[model samples]
Target: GPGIWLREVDRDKLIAVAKKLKEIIPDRVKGFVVGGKTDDVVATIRDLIALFGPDLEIVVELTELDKAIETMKKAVEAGASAILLRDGVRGVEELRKIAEEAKKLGVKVIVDVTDGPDVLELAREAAALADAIVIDTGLPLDTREAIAALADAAGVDVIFRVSGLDQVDDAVALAARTPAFKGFLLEGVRDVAAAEAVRARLAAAGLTDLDFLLALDGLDVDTAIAAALALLE
Candidate 1:
């Protein structure tokens, strides 16, 4: 059985995703995420959040080097609760440095990296460096083992992320299998109907104490908020 979750956050279609989810589920959901592709993205996200709502738990994705470090600080000043960092650093040094920066801002960090040959090692190092790590690549078993090791070392939470409806069960099951893995990012939805379907499927996965954070394809500001609220019910 597959656990299904909807993702509306794609690189190019965030605005449409936001508009559609709003039109379809007016007043039902309202949790927004802002992932930065460039330096100016945070300002764009700030403006959108103002237009949308203040209650949005804005999660900004960092892409650039200086910008990522600077954005982590700005996000905290802007009242963001979480920051997801995406990159491909081979050693633990970079992750540790980012962790130190995150600590200064009092923000929780999650590393979402590119799939590399040394991902498990990268993840292992990152898990110790950040508050949480998202299992975004193909090495589920290896990543799980790495997460286990990181948990032993860091004693913090990790994320078991799922990209499509097809991987929902395995993702949730893996989360259930590990004590340190406590959250999930849901993606791969075409619309609100699909999002609802994915949510329904995951609700029946028989797991407790795991946070289901819906991504909907790295969703835009508005729909991400909606999905977050919808997941509450």
Candidate 2:
């Protein structure tokens, strides 16, 4: 699904952004993520999910594989719908185990292919088990091509992470040709109006079908809400 990635800088600050999103949008899957590991971070995730209720998706990026699984468990217990595991860190067995656990909890699992052949191999190995696969656009074109095709053939949604708005044009071009490509994740967007402008441009270009996952990185509660409104409006 096209969505937003919210970070946990401070518990109150993160919830403030989430609260604003609730006020701004009537309903949508609100994505919350964090790069660090800590009890407080986990607590914030639970609190945000509780505040946002069923509409929130808590994504725990692979930091420590063991720790990531624990985080996913807590997130699921707190009512998260999905979890994203970075592909590089875990082996086939580990991946399978985590996927199984997530499955038992009724949480969809997505494998994030960041870089390296090992990750691609993990994608191949875990393809049948993973709910979907996410490929980073920053990788070499050839690498992305191979992984996208591989994941697509395995029969799962292939989501791409486009580092910023500047990469969107190229990303759309690639997606147009790659039948496996399902959506785009726009990272580091500071200006909500700019996001709206880009959306208009993409529509005019006839890429209206592409899913967009916008990241309002580093913005405060009001700014994040304003940015989110700009995208949804």
Candidate 3:
């Protein structure tokens, strides 16, 4: 699924952005990501739920375990699909606790290994509990086979949060090499032109089920796949 990370918590401002996106590329965007204080994010989710309804996927970013349980409780109630944990969670026990709480609430737990000093190790550890892995940095192209091998046991979907258009190529290549590669979280690249361009590459490289939000304007997946396959053959 193609997602955009919004760092703001103000409901009105967020709704404005949401409206603009809907008017522009309605289908090319699915997940709306929010990160901040627990209450702020919770409030934002509430607003999002009203605006996008139950179908919109809401992702909340929580940096610390201290507020993990509390945030999870409030977030899930406000219609968040998952609580994404970042660098603030370092200890194994801390992760386990969050995982346990998430399990109880039937909410997914996602671990972001971006910016970690030892990303592979961090990813390996989190794989046991994480429903998905999101990585943004320090991913090398040559050793992708090694990376894909790890996800075999966990069967966790891995998504790349690309900073800009510069890394989209690498992310596209990763999709071909890594079976678990799911989609991109375009941090700064929000336009439909850019998203469609990346979507073309991902489809060319054989990534299926590109988010309905990111589908080419007025283009259906059945026709798109056949078109790509026809040209390739």
Candidate 4:
């Protein structure tokens, strides 16, 4: 299913976006990826889970083993649904440890990998512990196709991240054309009205049925609210 990303760390701003998203279309709001391990981010995750209920998917990114372990515990305590870990950040044994804890908490574990020739290998390694794999296109747009195909072949759910607005069409097209595509993770929508306009354009172009994941990176409360309203509703 489609979802949204909440990369914002500010407590107020994050809550505002969460509230707006809940108001607009709670069902369309599949999950969230709260990047980083900080007090603010933790509080935001806690509040979001409390406000939206535990059914909403939440994935917290971690960089350190101890911190990842700590954050995972905190996330589970707050009723988060998942955790996102990067490739090469830690050894497979450590990742399995984290995955073990996450599983114990009944939360899913996901590994994020950059798009490249080695994506298949990365997916195989990630599949060792991760329930799903997220592919981010650092370069070479076609990298997503190969990565998605490889991940799908390995029987893992694939989520592709869109870097900017220009890729929206390609993302939507790929989602429609590719059976492996889980959904489109859109970049931060800074301007609310503009985002709504883009949403209108998507609907006009008959691409409204595609799953969307709007990023809330660096967006203010008002802007986040506007973007959520436009993109979600």
- The global C-alpha lDDT for each of the candidates, from Candidate 1 onward, is 0.60, 0.69, 0.63, 0.68
Which candidate do you rate higher for lDDT, 1 or 3? 3
Q: Please write out the lDDT profile of model 1 over residues 1-233, one tens digit for every residue.
A: 22212233343455555555455653443445566543444554564465456655556676565557776776666656667777745444566777778877776777774466777677667766777777762555665566556664686676666666667766666666677766666665445666676667766875533446566554556655455555555
- lDDT (0-100) at residue 113 of candidate 1? 48
Using TM-score, give the best candidate's number.
2
Best by lDDT: 2
Task: Using lDDT as the measure, name the better of candidate 2 and candidate 3.
Answer: 2
**How many pairs collide in each candidate, listed in order?**
17, 0, 3, 0
Write down the lDDT that model 3 would get: 0.63
For candidate 3, the per-residue lDDT at 46 reads: 80
Where model 3 places Cα greater than 4 Å from the true spot, the runs are 1-12, 21-29, 115-118, 141-145, 164-166, 190-200, 203-209, 212-233
lDDT per residue for candidate 4 within 1-233, as digits (tens), equals 23455565455666777787788777767667776556756787777777776677777877676678787887667666788887533355566777788888888887887644565566567756677777775446666676666667767777767666666666666656556666656675679766876687567656666666677774777777667666766
TM-score for each candidate, following the candidate numbering: 0.71, 0.83, 0.74, 0.79
Flag the better candidate by TM-score, 2 or 3: 2
Residue pairs with backbone overlap in model 3: 27-213, 28-213, 28-214
RMSD of each: 5.1, 2.8, 7.2, 3.3
